[PDB]
Amino acid sequence: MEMEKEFEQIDKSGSWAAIYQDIRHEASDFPSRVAKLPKNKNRNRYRDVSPFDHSRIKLHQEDNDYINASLIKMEEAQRSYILTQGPLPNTVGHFWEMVWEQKSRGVVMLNRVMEKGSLKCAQYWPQKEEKEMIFEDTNLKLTLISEDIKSYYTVRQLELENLTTQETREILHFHYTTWPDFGVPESPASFLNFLFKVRESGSLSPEHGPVVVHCSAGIGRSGTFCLADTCLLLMDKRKDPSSVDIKKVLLEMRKFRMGLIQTADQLRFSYLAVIEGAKFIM
Numbered sequence: 001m002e003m004e005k006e007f008e009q010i011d012k013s014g015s016w017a018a019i020y021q022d023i024r025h026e027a028s029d030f031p032s033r034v035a036k037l038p039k040n041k042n043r044n045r046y047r048d049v050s051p052f053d054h055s056r057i058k059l060h061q062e063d064n065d066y067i068n069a070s071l072i073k074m075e076e077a078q079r080s081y082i083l084t085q086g087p088l089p090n091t092v093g094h095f096w097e098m099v100w101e102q103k104s105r106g107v108v109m110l111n112r113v114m115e116k117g118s119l120k121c122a123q124y125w126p127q128k129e130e131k132e133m134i135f136e137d138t139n140l141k142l143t144l145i146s147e148d149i150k151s152y153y154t155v156r157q158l159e160l161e162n163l164t165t166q167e168t169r170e171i172l173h174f175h176y177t178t179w180p181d182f183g184v185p186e187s188p189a190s191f192l193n194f195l196f197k198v199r200e201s202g203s204l205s206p207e208h209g210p211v212v213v214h215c216s217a218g219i220g221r222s223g224t225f226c227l228a229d230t231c232l233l234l235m236d237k238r239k240d241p242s243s244v245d246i247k248k249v250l251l252e253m254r255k256f257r258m259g260l261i262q263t264a265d266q267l268r269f270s271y272l273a274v275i276e277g278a279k280f281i282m
């Protein structure tokens, strides 16, 4: 079926939970043996969210190459994304090592450091220009260059230096700051505006490594971001845009990382975002 009328048909019939459970039943199951090794317990935020072995990002290190991060490669859309958990106190150096080694231009953050009164990720970037951060375990230096605070999101320019080679690179940090503590946003308008700002920066384009996107677990809000982006790109590429099947795209992405889209409300919100976004594109 088309999207917008499939949408109204699920609303009127109140069957979002059944649709979402079907997706959960059909989703791929691949091994995640490296994630579960005992030496990696303090590298995982949640015991039930792990990268598959076949698509995990490897650190260029011979001691321990493990990080909780996955490469999502979308062949028809010609887009790639790295989805990862919010960094932990003992993985902030690994996080920036990955950004460096994978040649990423942008980092997309969809959570606040504290939500619901608890810490959802480490304070992994510097908050003042004159107070830079050094990650001694991976030999990187990170400096805040500039910060632009808007009503729904903040953009930061960061400098990452590889202290071993003295090479430097400019990284863009796109921080969506207004996702509510409970539920999903009422309108997708500010989320779509944010997606378009990431796109306009070059951070999603083939001349760079894959964008790094995270929330707390790296599957829920993060899944909504890449699912909406890929669906809108396919609607632009194909002769028949109504042939884009959001459930099929989501199942394809779940071949690369488990659990993408965590609730039936996130599923409904993803439909809403793609529907509204397709009108603005034209």
Ligand SMILES: CCc1cc2c(=O)[nH]cnc2s1
Pocket: 192, 193, 196, 277, 280, 281
């Ligand atoms: C001025 C260009 C824009 C495109 C776009 C979109 O596709 N979705 C949401 N906001 C915008 S702004």
